[PDB]
């Protein structure tokens, strides 16, 4: 049992929501959300700079730290870093971004990098500003993460279709 709330169960593993991840994570403190980061960990805009606005920028100065330590992550990658005051740890992974030309099918790279984690708070990744189709991010999600995924979708509208659509 956890903390998580109103979520529908799609899978045996995989949940999902209407909600604003950044209220989520203020609301349930979870061990693990997931940021959808780019490999600089710049987190400008989309659900990346939300959440970091959240930390008042501190998850950039973090950031900007591993960065000049480690050189920026691979696409389909991940880091784990601080959550801040919205979770326990923070793990940013790097889907694919369409509207920069990168190979959709590191998306399911990306999402493997959940299976490190018994439950998290996560985005669809590649979905937004990153330009791929969310309804495939779901299926991509559903066939790969085997550890318990609380999806939360920021779009009411794209909620309801991603819900009515799925198989
Ligand atoms: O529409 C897609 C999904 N996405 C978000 N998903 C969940 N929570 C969020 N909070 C702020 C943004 C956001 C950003 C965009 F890439």
Redesign the pocket.
């Known amino acids: 049992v956890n903390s998580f709330s109103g979520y529908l169960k799609l899978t045996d593993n995989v949940y999902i929501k209407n909600?604003?991840?950044?209220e989520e994570a203020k609301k349930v403190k979870p061990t693990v959300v997931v940021n959808?980061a780019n490999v600089y960990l710049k987190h400008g805009g989309?659900?990346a700079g939300?959440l970091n606005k959240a930390t008042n920028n501190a998850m950039q100065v973090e950031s900007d730290d591993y960065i000049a330590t480690n050189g920026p992550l691979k696409v389909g990658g991940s880091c784990v870093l601080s959550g801040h005051n919205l979770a326990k740890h923070c793990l940013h992974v790097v889907g694919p971004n369409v509207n920069k030309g990168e190979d959709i099918q590191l998306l399911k790279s990306a999402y493997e990098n959940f299976n490190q984690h018994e439950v998290l708070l996560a985005?669809?990744l590649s979905?937004?500003?990153?330009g791929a189709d969310?309804i495939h991010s779901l299926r991509v999600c559903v066939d790969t993460v085997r550890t318990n995924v609380y999806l939360?979708?920021?779009?009411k509208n794209?909620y309801d279709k991603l819900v009515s659509s799925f198989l």
């Open positions: 909600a604003d991840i950044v959808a989309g659900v939300a985005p669809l979905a937004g500003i990153f969310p939360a979708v920021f779009d794209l």
